[PDB]
């Protein structure tokens, strides 16, 4: 059973026994499918549960099978799982062929109809639209170069640049107006890919390249699509420098797209060259520069599903060994996290294992002995190991290295801002990146401060959302007063530095201590001169706060008055609740967090008319297993834990609590033991999983809130 369909090598042996016991039940296989795949979360099945119609993702995007496979005809679990994989690969290939045909139809066109482009984007998945855009652009550039092959001829490459420019303008226009979130992410991926294509085309124009075999064009990633080939898996040939690989054709759902900085392209080139010479790469460097996500992006672009072995105290071996032999079997990639954090014995053992598999890979240029089993090495297999300065002695001769010394933050911010529809993106990025550089060093050091690159990306996304809210509000006001509605007409008039300052104030000021606020305001004055942001006070909320504080005997003050700081803190808490579904009111005991959120809840109930219900839960008083729920060793019955019980009661909507506002205040200390299960909740997914396998979606009204005293032991994640 284990050898056939090696994709369940990654799931646990106990989970293997569970899936064997649950063989005649497809409804309980969803967790395993989440585990072994990349972004696949559930298989779409009919009401009968005899044939699988298609696959879906965590976000909700789904793929439909051209020829669905019936489980009844092939009852064996491994047999129809292999059929599912093969049919998913074939369907992705065929949809990619359709999408490239479409994009070349809109390709080589003077003008682009926004309606047709939006319909095309909605028709196909994000990975497929990005891949089709890349294929079409690469083929167009290759054809234009071939026309230039005569030597000093007329330049059709300017036509390619103009087409990319008008497509980018269309995307920038489209992203500005309100869109569904999935189509929003699709647009963002498409526009960052097109920005990279535009920049590389500009470089090609500047270099006056005239030959299709010139190394200047060879260095950039080229996509070759061959619709005539019979084998669907080999249809797409991704080729860059000397190395050339086939597309993995595995579903990725929707993934964050890296901006392709010049250093990112350097990492791409180095890893690809290492893989061509049949040895892995070791992108060492300080933490926080996107090494592991660089490897993830390289794998995703190739269509290969990558493993992130987070190496900390949670790291294991027996599971590590079986998932490693599975990686060897399937051919998927595996990217280790920080390797220097292992125990010396631990590090030596994994080093010997990876040395053995790497020797097998070089021999393939074929089986290797893993757990006393000879394992055929797939040529597509690749392993990447990242340091935080070194590599063990048995691996130095076996692995290439690269310096992840510092990412190009300016280009990262410029591309991300341009993806949000911001105009003058380059100026804003060149201002904001040094601003965070100043923040990281001039501000007083604290444990909860985070001025990293992820902070930049989060702040920039929040700024984009703030701009969208402002344009929607102005559109509503224009509908009320007058009728002349034009998105661009408000767009170019609308200031944008104010929006960035508002976003950074709304996201960053709350984390500041009482002393750091003047320093932050001075930094905004220095980097963004003359421009200031004043938060629009919510007068109705202020009156409700006054009335509730009077009713609860609390003190009230505005600004410099007694209680002003507390009121501003409550207002910032309200804003974070508005823009986030997860909160942590960190502060010393005796600061007033509890009844601050209490008065905010009561004022919100008395203003908006939505009844407020709070469920105060202490995480440390009760044990983690009882907090989340017990797993029955024999019947697998679900004795829902306290938090799980509250969530299920809220979800069931027995007494209309969905219409009510629910705040799950987690008063008590926080440590990375119970919060690991809640980590899947505080992300944008907003799903909660259970050890039995049931997964629950979080209603929009529920707001997870942490009331903790200090963050000496809370992980930065």
């Amino acid at each position: 059973e284990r050898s056939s369909f090696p994709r369940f090598y990654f799931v646990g042996d106990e989970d293997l026994l569970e899936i064997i016991g649950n063989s005649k039940n497809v409804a309980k296989l969803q967790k395993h499918f989440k585990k072994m795949f990349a972004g696949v979360s559930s298989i779409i099945l009919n009401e009968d549960n005899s044939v699988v119609l298609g696959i879906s993702s965590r976000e909700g995007e789904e793929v439909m099978f051209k020829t669905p496979v019936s489980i009844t005809e092939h009852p064996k679990i491994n047999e129809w799982l292999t059929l599912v994989e093969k049919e998913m690969r074939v369907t992705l290939a065929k949809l990619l062929a359709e999408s490239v045909t479409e994009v070349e139809i809109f390709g080589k066109a003077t003008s682009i109809d926004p309606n047709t482009y939006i319909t095309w984007i909605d028709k196909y998945q994000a990975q497929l639209v990005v891949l089709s855009a890349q294929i079409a652009w690469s083929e167009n550039v290759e054809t234009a170069l071939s026309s230039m092959g005569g030597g000093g001829d007329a330049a059709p490459l300017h036509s390619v640049l103009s087409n990319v420019e008008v497509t980018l303008n269309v995307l920038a226009d489209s992203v500005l107006m309100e869109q569904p979130p999935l189509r929003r992410r699709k647009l963002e991926h498409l526009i960052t890919e097109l920005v990279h294509q535009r920049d590389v085309t500009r470089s090609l124009i500047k270099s006056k390249i005239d030959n299709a075999k010139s190394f200047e064009w060879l260095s950039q990633m080229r996509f070759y699509f061959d619709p005539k080939q019979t084998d669907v898996l080999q249809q797409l040939s991704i080729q860059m420098a000397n190395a050339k690989f086939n597309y993995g054709f595995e579903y990725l759902g929707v993934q964050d797209k890296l901006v392709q900085t010049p250093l990112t392209d350097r990492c791409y080139l180095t890893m690809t060259q290492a893989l061509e010479a049949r040895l892995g790469g070791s992108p060492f460097g300080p933490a926080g520069t996107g090494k592991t996500e660089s490897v993830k992006a390289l794998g995703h672009q190739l269509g290969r599903f990558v493993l992130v072995f987070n190496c900390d105290e949670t790291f294991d071996f027996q599971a590590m060994g079986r998932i490693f032999v599975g990686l060897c079997q399937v051919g998927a990639w595996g990217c280790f996290d920080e390797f220097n954090r292992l125990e010396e014995r631990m590090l030596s053992a994994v080093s010997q294992q990876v040395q053995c598999i790497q020797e097998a890979l070089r021999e393939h240029s074929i089986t290797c002995e893993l757990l006393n089993k000879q394992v055929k090495v797939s040529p597509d297999m690749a392993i990447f190991i990242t340091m935080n300065p070194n590599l063990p002695d048995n691996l130095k001769k076996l692995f290439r290295s690269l310096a992840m010394t510092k990412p190009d933050r300016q280009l990262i911010a410029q591309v991300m801002l341009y993806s949000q529809g911001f105009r003058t993106a380059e100026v804003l990025a060149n201002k904001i990146v040094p601003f965070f550089k100043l923040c990281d060093e001039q501000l007083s050091s604290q444990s909860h401060y985070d001025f990293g690159l992820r902070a930049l990306k989060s702040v920039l996304v929040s700024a984009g959302n703030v701009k969208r809210e402002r344009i929607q509000k102005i559109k509503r006001e224009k509908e009320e007063r007058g009728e002349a509605v034009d998105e661009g007409e408000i767009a170019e008039n609308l200031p944008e530095q104010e929006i960035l300052i508002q976003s950074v104030c709304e996201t960053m000021v709350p984390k500041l201590v009482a002393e750091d606020i003047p320093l932050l305001f001075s930094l905004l004055s220095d980097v963004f001169p003359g421009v200031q942001y004043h938060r629009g006070e919510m007068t109705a909320l202020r009156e409700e706060l006054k009335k509730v504080c009077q009713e609860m005997y609390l003190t009230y003050g505005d600004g410099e008055e007694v209680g002003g700081m507390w009121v501003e803190k409550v207002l910032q808490l309200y804003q974070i609740t508005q823009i986030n579904h997860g909160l942590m009111m960190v502060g010393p005991s005796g600061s007033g967090k509890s009844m601050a959120w209490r008065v905010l809840l009561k004022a919100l109930e008395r203003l908006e008319g939505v009844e407020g219900v709070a469920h105060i839960i202490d995480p440390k008083a009760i044990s983690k297993d009882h907090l989340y729920g017990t797993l029955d060793p024999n019947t697998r019955e679900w004795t829902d834990g306290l938090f799980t019980h509250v969530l299920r009661k809220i979800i069931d909507s027995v007494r209309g609590e969905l219409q009510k506002r629910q705040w799950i205040v987690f008063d008590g200390d926080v440590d990375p033991e119970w919060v690991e299960n809640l980590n899947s909740v505080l992300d944008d997914n907003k799903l909660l999983t259970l050890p039995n396998g049931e997964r629950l979606s979080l209603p929009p009204n529920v707001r997870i809130m942490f009331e903790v005293q200090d963050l000496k032991y809370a992980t930065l994640a």
């Binding site: 010479a277 130095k396 100043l438």
Partner: protein, 757 residues
């Protein structure tokens, strides 16, 4: 006995420590013989010269002597025997010629004054003192000739000879004793022992140590050879230290055959068990330090069939690749200058580069006997060896720029002409010449006929690079000898009392004010003053605890115990070091640097107290003194931006290095002192190459001007600034305009940089 002890100890010692052990044996013999005196004072000064503290007024600034030369000569004159030395330095005229002589140790002038003639060993040690004071770069050769004078000229005459391994394996070693071959990275000693086995007609078993099956094969081979008397071999034995201890334990209680001999080729790393090192005869193998030797090794490693392929131009490409690899590998030895850190440019980079060249020449030349030089994919090789290979380990941007300069200078269509120069002006006007041959044999012959007089100008560095390396090796000599040779309670009491007397008493904080809070320079200086005051209080309290412990009034706490242990051993305490320090800096010089830093901090605190932020602007700080100078440059940037209401991103840094008295305090200008220039001299903000090791910039002015959006001229160069001499941390980059007829690439290859200290 002396000779055999040296010839048996040095066979398993690094080449730089041979002379250290030689002088140790020389001191042993000097004490042993009765005729000559003990020379305690001379050796004590020769080992402890540098910890004698001086003053600025104690240096008379003699003409023809540098500052460090002045300190050395006055310190040497503190000895009563050399009291009249400075008078003869001023009086003598032949001193000037001898000071810059190529070999000053051969003809050391007679300067030391004495009433009676001295023994030849006394003359030798006096010349040792003079050489150390005047020309420390020859201290290694001076030591060589001193040991030759003491124990005989041919005392080291065995070390230069090749390893007579056959005699050592045959007799003088027991069959129980395993022969140990510890080789530095990038070398394998298996060849010598394999050839020895071939010439002795003795069959050996070559087993590599990679995994458990390797362990089993090694154990089976050992069990067979212990009774059959044959030899065994193990490769990279260092991989399994626990199995190494197990093998040592098994070897201890086992009687071997007379003919049995056990070999273990190893790597030099801490992980190897100490017990095997103690219980076996070790051998150290180091590659010969030469460009010609590196080329010979490279051309021997690469199979002759692979170089001679269908394109005849391949051999030229392989020769060029070998030259580049050798040039970088021999630049590695000059770590502060040749690079910024010791990278691992091992043989794997060579193999990857060879494979890349092979595949790209196969791609471009599809089985063509000849291919035109312009059709060779120069861009592909340059880009790959700049970014993927030889570039992956490169983390600093400036080393990457240096690598780009090397590749662009070497790999080009110009390289295929008969007038190609692999180096420029190696000695005087002579320069190396690229071979005109097209076959591998021609290049091998050409490298074999190399002049064998390699100077640092062969590989790009200025000729004085050898001088700095030799001086550093001499300093390492002195440190190793000093390390090689209760009362310690009294000595620590004395040194702690001296440090309390030397270190400033207290440092005043800065007075916070709303206007001062608004000013960014005041914020930076207040943070610096707080850090300095906290660390000064910590150091003063710790030393007070130490001195109280010396009198017995207090008992040694565990943290106190560690502090005293680290002090007596001379290691820098961890609790004291909160700012970036050179790795090898000892405690005494750390305390001196701290005294200077606290003095500067007191100066700025007094200046701020007297006035305010406006007076805080025109203070000529030294970047070395400040704990984080990049914070200072950022603070100046913010100050000028606030003053002129400009964005921080639209500002660029310009440098106008002028004399201290001839400086204008413009509102956008800040005074920076103590900056030192390496490998060049500035004149009217114009850079010029020179052989001087370091030029002191009188006063560097930092001016911030708006970004003009004009492309930089071809005459300006970007010079990195490093805080310390090891060049481990980067502060910022300046832009300097070089003088006429100068090549920026030549600036780049010579490792020119600005040092804060």
């Amino acid at each position: 006995l002396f000779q055999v002890a040296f010839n048996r100890v040095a066979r398993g010692m690094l080449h730089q420590d041979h002379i250290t052990f030689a002088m140790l044996l020389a001191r042993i013999k000097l004490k042993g013989t009765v005729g000559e005196p003990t020379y305690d004072a001379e050796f004590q000064h020769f080992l402890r010269g540098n910890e004698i503290v001086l003053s600025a007024g104690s240096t008379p600034r003699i003409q023809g002597l540098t500052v460090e030369q002045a300190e050395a000569v006055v310190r040497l004159s503190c000895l009563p025997a050399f009291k009249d030395l400075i008078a003869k330095v001023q009086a003598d005229e032949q001193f000037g010629i001898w000071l810059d002589s190529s070999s000053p140790e051969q003809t050391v002038p007679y300067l030391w004054s004495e009433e009676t003639p001295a023994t030849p060993i006394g003359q030798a040690i006096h010349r040792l003192l003079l050489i150390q004071a005047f020309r420390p770069d020859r201290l290694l050769a001076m030591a060589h000739m001193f040991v030759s004078t003491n124990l005989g000229e041919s005392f080291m005459s065995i070390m230069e000879q090749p390893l007579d391994l056959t005699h050592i394996v045959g007799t003088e070693v027991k069959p129980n004793t395993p022969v140990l071959m510890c080789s530095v990275p990038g070398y394998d000693a298996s060849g010598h022992v394999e050839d020895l086995a071939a010439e002795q007609n003795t069959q050996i078993t070559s087993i590599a140590i990679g995994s458990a099956e390797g362990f089993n094969q090694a154990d089976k081979a050992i069990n067979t050879a212990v009774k059959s008397g044959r030899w065994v071999m193990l490769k990279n034995v260092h991989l399994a230290p626990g199995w190494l201890m197990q093998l040592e334990k098994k070897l201890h209680s086992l009687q071997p055959h007379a003919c049995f001999r056990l070999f273990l080729t190893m790597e030099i790393n801490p992980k190897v068990p100490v017990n095997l090192l103690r219980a076996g005869r070790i051998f150290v193998f180091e590659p010969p330090p030469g460009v010609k030797a590196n080329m010979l090794r490279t051309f021997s490693s690469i199979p002759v069939s692979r170089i001679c392929k269908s394109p005849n131009e391949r051999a030229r490409l392989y020769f060029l690749l070998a030259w580049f690899h050798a040039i970088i590998q021999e630049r590695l030895r000059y770590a502060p200058l040749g690079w910024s850190k010791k990278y691992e440019f091992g043989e794997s980079d060579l193999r990857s580069a060879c494979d890349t060249v092979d595949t790209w020449l196969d791609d471009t030349a599809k089985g063509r006997q000849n291919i035109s030089p312009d059709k060779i994919p120069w861009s592909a090789l340059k880009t790959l060896m700049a970014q993927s290979i030889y570039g992956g380990r490169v983390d600093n941007e400036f080393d990457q720029r240096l690598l780009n300069t090397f590749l662009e200078r070497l790999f080009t269509t110009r390289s295929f002409d008969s007038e190609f120069k692999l180096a420029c002006k190696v000695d005087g006007h002579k320069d190396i010449q690229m071979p005109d041959g097209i076959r591998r044999e021609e290049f091998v012959q050409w490298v074999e006929l190399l002049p064998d007089t390699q100077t640092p100008s062969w590989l790009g560095l200025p000729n004085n690079a050898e001088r700095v390396l030799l001086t550093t090796q001499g300093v390492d000599m002195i440190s190793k000898m000093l390390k090689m040779q209760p009362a310690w309670m009294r000595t620590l009491h004395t040194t702690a009392s001296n440090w309390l007397h030397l270190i400033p008493q207290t440092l005043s904080h800065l007075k916070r004010t709303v206007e001062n809070i608004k000013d960014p320079l005041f914020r930076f200086f207040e943070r610096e003053v707080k850090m300095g005051a906290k660390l000064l209080q910590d150091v003063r309290q710790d030393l007070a605890d130490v001195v109280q412990v010396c009198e017995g009034k207090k008992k040694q706490t565990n943290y106190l115990r560690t502090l005293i242990n680290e002090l007596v051993k001379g290691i820098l305490p961890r609790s004291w070091s909160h700012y970036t320090v050179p790795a090898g800096m000892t405690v005494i010089q750390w305390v001196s640097d701290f005294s200077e830093r606290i003095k500067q901090l007191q100066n700025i605190s007094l200046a701020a107290a007297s006035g305010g932020a406006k007076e805080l602007k025109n203070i000529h700080v030294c970047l070395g003194g400040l704990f984080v100078p990049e914070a200072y440059i950022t603070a100046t940037r913010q100050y000028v931006a606030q003053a002129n209401s400009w964005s921080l991103e639209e500002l660029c840094l310009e440098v106008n290095v002028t004399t201290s008295q001839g400086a204008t305090l413009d509102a956008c200008s800040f005074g920076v002192t103590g900056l030192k220039l390496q490998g060049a001299t500035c004149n009217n903000n114009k850079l010029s190459l020179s052989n001087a090791i370091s030029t002191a910039l009188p006063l560097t002015q930092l001016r911030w001007v708006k970004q003009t959006n004009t492309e930089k001229k071809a005459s300006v160069v970007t010079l990195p600034v490093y805080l310390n001499f090891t060049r481990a941390d980067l502060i910022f980059t300046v832009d300097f305009e070089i003088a006429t007829k100068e090549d920026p690439r030549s600036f780049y290859e010579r490792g020119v940089a600005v040092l804060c200290t």
